[PDB]
Amino acid sequence: SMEMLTKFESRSSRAKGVAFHPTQPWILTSLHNGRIQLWDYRMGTLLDRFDGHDGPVRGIAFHPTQPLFVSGGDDYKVNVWNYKSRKLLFSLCGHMDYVRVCTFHHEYPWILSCSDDQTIRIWNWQSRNCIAILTGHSHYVMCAAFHPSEDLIVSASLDQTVRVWDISGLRMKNSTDAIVKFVLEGHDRGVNWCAFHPTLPLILSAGDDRLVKLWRMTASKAWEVDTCRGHFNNVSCCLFHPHQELILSASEDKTIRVWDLNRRTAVQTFRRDNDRFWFITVHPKLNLFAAAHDSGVMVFKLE
Known part of the structure; x- marks a missing residue:
């Protein structure tokens, strides 16, 4: 039905996050042991290692154009690095518990982070200030993502909700700044992940109920389209x-599953x-995927 063409594998202690560089043949891998690796997956070579956290590092992302990446750790810190000069530029402090995800905005000079402290924080990485604290979740915020073209954020929480936030107010400035638009109800256990489709008005969420849910939205409403059932963890x-037209999911049941989008x-x-x-x-451009698991990271194509 589909074959996995494995292009590169790192054998390491448990990996938590991985991020593709947009133009270079690199991945960052963030490890349970607190270290960050920079790999060239075409040559199979470890280019660098970055040690600036204590405990697991779950958040890792490249800036789309700048020579920067950002990491988020169980030590509550959001670290901003320069991979050309190979130094930790500064730490963004504020979160009071594990940082689960951290990403750069594609246009504005912003970093997005979310935390077990039940908040989503938006930082300005030029001023190094926190410019918004999004509150409302009643449990760990396990994931948050910027929309690729609209002033929206989607977040997933162990409170069993997926929230879509309107941050058009924060954008106009350059808490009216962020207002929750949708509190999506459907999961009957905690939600671990949420994702926007790059070009279509679709949302995926997945959690401890073993379900992957597909949502559709317009400017004025959202609805649950269907559920991918089968994971047993x-x-x-x-x-x-x-x-x-495919969906991908990864699970503690030791499987990666591909599903028909339609x-x-x-x-x-x-x-x-x-x-x-x-x-x-x-990968933001190529039909190239990466997965983090208990024994390292794999980069692969699907045919």
């Missing part, structure tokens, strides 16, 4: 295939005998 992560039927399951999956991502 917590789903850690999910995403849209950018250029095919039918939500199973297309292909990939299994590892001993490794739980903690994260999957897709």
